């Protein structure tokens, strides 16, 4: 038999428990196969369903679970199932069965679960943005880039920046699902099932979409593990991004952010210090989902056709990403629901340093006048206002028309931070008008992809 | 102004010139947006797009081209226009116009031609596989599984086998076209426009779909640049499975396929050696897009809200990958397309090693024979057949009856490779009848994802 | 108290067990440095070592492990000794510890261990290869390059070409570890300790050579660890090169080896057909183990100073890499030793296609011929054998004369495989002398690089 | 003749063409080799170097330079040469000439120039860090974890922080070094050379320190690549960290820093607004630099021996990565040397949030005080000093003493920033004497890590 060395690297059963219910399910539908193809009696059909149930039930409480002998968990469930009806009656299941088909179809099975719990989580960070926008609809912050501060920007505006990525990532889960919902079942090896067995009804059965256009193909390919990669690891980069966010926030130099006490770690002794873990988890996790992508792609890299045991290294990378992703979303949006917002420090910083007169130079560019000449004007606009330390609202109609005649009293409507940020009122702007409008189509596309997502 | 490192650090221009035609098209499409606006007037608007027309004739030509002191493609051109109508006609371009959601635009234009031109790639490659599967309708080869021969197939089984994969690349580049075809334009440097102008209008005149409903996501996020490397990495892997059986088919061990002289390196000595360079770089340039992909995910992580410098190294791995891509896809169909298949030695090989004792065992199956039953059976057909030293269908029927009286002389059926192959006639099965209807499909599904990608 | 999903995303109980041991030697240290510090009695410390002896005892057996309720495993370990020695003596060795340099000391002390596992695991794969060439020293095959016939060479060449590959990762084992035995112990949470310890005597308690140079580097940097980690993936890539020569000399087609029962899968009923699942593994985890590399530079990224809490996810990556080569290691070695090589198949392919025409070329230059005409000569020699249905060996004397005078009988010396290896005598080359010379030396290497890694 | 897609897909000298003087100078040693071997006279011999030398000048000069038909920068000064010397003296060069070893060894040339160029680079940016380091000795900061204040550090500690690891990568050159300085020319294509040269003769003449010990090995392996690849990207990650603590410290908020002018990019706007570009582009490119290591790996994966053009693939990534670095390290050193340091600002905030209360229970627990007492005593004295809006340094000696008897006026030794990280006086720690001895020694490690890449 095969040697130490061999059966210890050859084992799954250590990730591949998981499977077992669908597993049981693919196990069920194969004895209608078999009952279908004149090779069960009812008796034995019945029995062998009777078997599986039971079998269900162990593996269900615990009962039941593998050996250090059982190589993997359709081995283990096998043993099971004979240790429940007996070798002959079990032993009939055996017909018609190949072992590369059966691993591809459950393997599918588990994923397209699978990311729907990732979507429902995806959902709930998603909402966790939407209400606090919606909670601080008013607030005013710095708009960063560099890290530095431009223009000014709400708050709720900023906050929903990070919805819109999680919205497409959704709508990547979407579209890879229709890929995933194909049945490779009556593949065989890889040449087709000789058994004259329907593809179409076993999908059916099996609540796949269709049955696969090439059994070689079907064995064989990996490309749905590799998207479904993909698209872990391009959330888990859009959650680090408002990790990212969440971490300079908390510091207490910036100070935008109060953590909540259960949602954070904190000091025996500092009474106030508060540590984003969970954000800075969601960042270094990010790399690790990364990485399982990068290394799966590379698995896959130049297999030749047909099966081959390289690709037993499929399950345990795309495993980790939806693990990791299923503790990481009730974590950021518990996080981000119960951040408390420091809303004078955030609008104190957002007209420092003139950033207003970009909206100065803009206003003026509106009313016709030439960008060089207003941007001189600003220039003047925000020397002069620093030799009398004022901001530039607190300049005189006298001295905004000395610096320029077209720099009417008109031009402070955009020199305070409301004004300023009500002035970007285009599609997507910054706008209060604008920022409702968006938070609206939020809440309907979330809606969409939730029941698009329904099976 | 910029010490001489940090100038030559942010200098974009020894990649970014691929940008050009899109930067005229958007300064066109800005002429209108001003002249909308009541900025510019008839003469003012006409002269720009003039001098626009001059100046992309001359990067069209090369006649134009950018300077060691220009920083990037946008810097460059804007000399240009100036140089060709003044800078007091040229500055009035820069009312309203933001650097950061042009530059992600651009990109975005850009990307949507180059995913068209690797797609037509890809679809030539599909084209070659069918090719070669239509003119060898009957060609039964080994049906490998770790290298080993297990199942006769039929040669256009395998080879189209590498043809679903790259549909499947099809479907994705539909799939990523329409979150690539949202338009940034018109989110400023972050915040939103604050000139009045219209987004969706703009982004009509673009050809893109929709424009954003961010404006800080619009400017910051990448993931659409990450899903089109992921995407070209994907291609790129499923091309190495095609490279790996034609590098491993080529060699004179296997002698499955005699390499064209043009599509091969070879040596004037012996004429008959040929070497399969092409799919060798395939096999090594999908590690390279594989890093391409990994690498940008990185570079996108923990990314802070908006705009960030880290940004600009969006583009040169995505440039990389397509340019790869657009090489090795003319270079991949060629190959294919000029192979010649040694059809006899394929043949000959196809029933070597008692394969067809799997046939015999599954025909027994179909009987109603249990399994332990059947797999006796053919342990006891390859040994008597090899104690005559004959294949399986010389056995006589008084043999294949003392093996086991269920062995009647129908067993015959699939003791020939074109009976066995004959035997698996489910959907996706080497029957030679699903066979022929799966190429029939593969040619209408290539058709359509072609007409979807036409804009 | 902590939400049930910050609870569980920051629980590591599930792979930091595998530290218990380390753990508790640290605490034995700590326990020295207490008393050293005059902060424990002679009694106060013999009963602590005596509780932490009564602990990893019960954590050796497996009577003592860790509950859901704890977060890591020293919080595990900190309550098994509050139970074996009371809260008030236990609690006295929270004094003067941190757990920030403690963590740190710990993976670092497990690593070092660790690679030790692997740097054995190699050198049972160089000496399996060893072995297989020191049982042929005389059989010669085919050199291929380009997976194509080139020049002859001795099998014993081709199998040590894998060896020397395992040797340069051995020497980078070795270069790792100078910079793995750094103690951070001491160092704090960030700034140094204010007790007044002795980092260096703690040092060398823990087995380290050396202690920090600084806190802050010494608790926040985690190079060591992705140095580790591309040396796991260099050696499984350079395992993963083995893997691809024994997948392709199994294939019926090369039949260069026969794969034995034990080190293989296959089936009864065709006895002979055998699978190289152990490298087609190998094959696969080498992906798994780049992208293990990948994710933990992704995670070191763009980290500010000093420890955060993304810098917990640097255990598990390479936790993984080194379980998976633990794995690989006695498989491939196991794999090597029971290869079957047929080295009559191999013998006849070496000439093949008329290959020793370079060998004809390059010897007519040894003699002064010109470069250019030297080869026509040779493919005159082939064509004039071409004709005849011969080897060039069997061209006349007065053949060869005819092709060129420069052509004396004296040729023939390499126009056998015997006589082309034989001729390529220089340093490395495949002469049986210089590959007799070039094992011995192999054996060398091995015992010194064997040698420096025991402490 | 090779189809123009094969011909395109070939070409490497977009990229190749660095490698030019390595070419040259390996044809001046294989002309060296042919006369030793008596197959040039001395007429030739000089002839080919004085054509060697013309031609050596004008690739100096650009006067001489590669055409489209060139495939490779070997082919283009093949064609030079001859261009120079007429065939016939040209092309006696070719006798006893491998592609193989030729390309390996060039590689390692460049790679090995390559490597100090880098090495010099990152002694400027430890440079930088130090002399900042030295320039501001008293400078107190909070030390960081979590990005949250924890111990107060030296600023001079925590630059010196990120020196370190540049050491660390400065050491991990040297290692590499050793395995980049073996000879690859003599090995011929595969097989080693039949010309009868002498490989070590040939390593010593072109620089190396030996000549390879297996010619299979010595022509097929690239891990030296792969390693190089990975000191880069660990390089780069090294100063990814520098670079987030750069731009954090930047932001308005913090204000640790202020960036100079010709090292940053400014507003035309906002008069005092500077962005960290250089650090920004540091960390996006590190991304960038782990995914060329990443490809790489995969493009070695599998790899079956000896050479396959797979490998042409080992460059580019290199080259990329080394050029991204020489941009990198002296925009670094120039931003790490430019950097003004708002020492007030820093002194402000060290002890802010009671954070020297840590301190407190610490020098209780070194004055017997049980862990306990210790930590709900700092914790009274929090309280205490909370309620009087005061810090822990204002308590009175009653106030104290009420608290516990144990907290004598003694304790005021650490109640201040100073006396804080004076008593931190450990190997490593952050107290001032300490920093200094740490800082001469970074001066000495700088300097022998210089003398062992002096070649």
Chains 1, 2, 3, 4 share one sequence.
């Not at 710095?142 to 708050?155: C, D, E, F, M, N």
């Not at 081959?308 to 996080?335: I, T, Y």
């Not at 320029?404 to 009122?425: F, H, K």
């Not at 997507?428 to 939020?442: C, D, H």
């Amino acid at each position: 038999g095969p040697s130490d060395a061999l059966a210890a690297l050859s084992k799954s059963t250590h990730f591949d428990w998981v499977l077992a219910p669908y597993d049981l399910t693919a196990s069920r539908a194969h004895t209608m196969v078999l009952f279908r193809a004149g090779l069960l009696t009812e008796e034995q059909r019945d029995g062998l369903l009777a078997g599986l149930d039971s079998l269900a039930q162990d593996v269900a409480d615990g009962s039941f679970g593998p050996l250090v002998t059982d190589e993997d968990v359709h081995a283990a469930l096998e043993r099971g199932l004979i240790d429940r009806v007996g070798p002959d009656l079990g032993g009939r299941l055996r017909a018609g069965r190949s072992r590369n088909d059966q691993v591809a179809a459950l393997f599918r099975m588990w994923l397209r679960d699978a990311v729907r719990r990732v979507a429902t989580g995806v959902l709930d960070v998603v909402g966790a943005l939407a209400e606090q926008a919606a909670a601080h609809p008013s607030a005013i912050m710095p708009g960063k880039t560099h890290l530095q501060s431009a223009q000014p920007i709400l708050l709720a505006h900023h906050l929903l920046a990070h919805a819109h990525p999680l919205l497409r990532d959704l709508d990547r889960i979407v579209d890879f699902d229709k890929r995933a919902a194909v049945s490779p079942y009556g593949s065989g090896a890889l040449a087709g099932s000789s058994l004259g067995l329907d593809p179409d009804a076993i999908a059916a059965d099996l609540g796949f979409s269709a049955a696969a256009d090439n059994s070689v193909d079907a064995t064989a390919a990996r490309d749905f593990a590799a998207e479904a990669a993909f698209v872990f690891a391009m959330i888990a980069v859009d959650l680090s991004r408002l990790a990212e966010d969440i971490i300079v926030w908390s510091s207490t130099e910036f100070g935008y952010v109060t953590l909540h006490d259960s949602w954070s770690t904190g000091s025996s002794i500092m009474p106030q210090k508060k540590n984003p873990d969970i954000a800075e988890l969601a960042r270094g996790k990010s790399g690790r989902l990364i990485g399982n992508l990068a290394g799966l792609l590379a698995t896959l890299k130049a297999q030749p056709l047909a099966y081959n045991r390289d690709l037993q290294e499929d399950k345990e990378p795309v495993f980790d990403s939806v693990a990791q992703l299923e503790l990481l979303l009730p974590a950021m949006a518990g996080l981000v629901a119960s951040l408390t917002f420091n809303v004078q420090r955030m609008a104190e910083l957002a007209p420092a340093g003139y950033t207003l007169a970009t909206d100065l130079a803009e206003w003026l560019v509106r009313q016709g006048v030439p960008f060089r000449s207003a941007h001189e004007a600003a220039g003047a606009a925000v020397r002069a206002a620093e030799q009398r330390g004022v901001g530039l609202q607190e300049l005189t109609d006298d001295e905004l028309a000395a610096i320029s005649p077209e720099l009417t009293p008109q031009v402070r409507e955009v020199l305070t931070i409301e004004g300023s940020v009500s002035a970007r009122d285009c599609r997507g702007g910054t706008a209060p008008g604008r920022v409702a409008e968006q938070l609206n189509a939020i809440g309907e596309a979330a809606e969409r992809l939730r029941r698009q997502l329904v099976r």
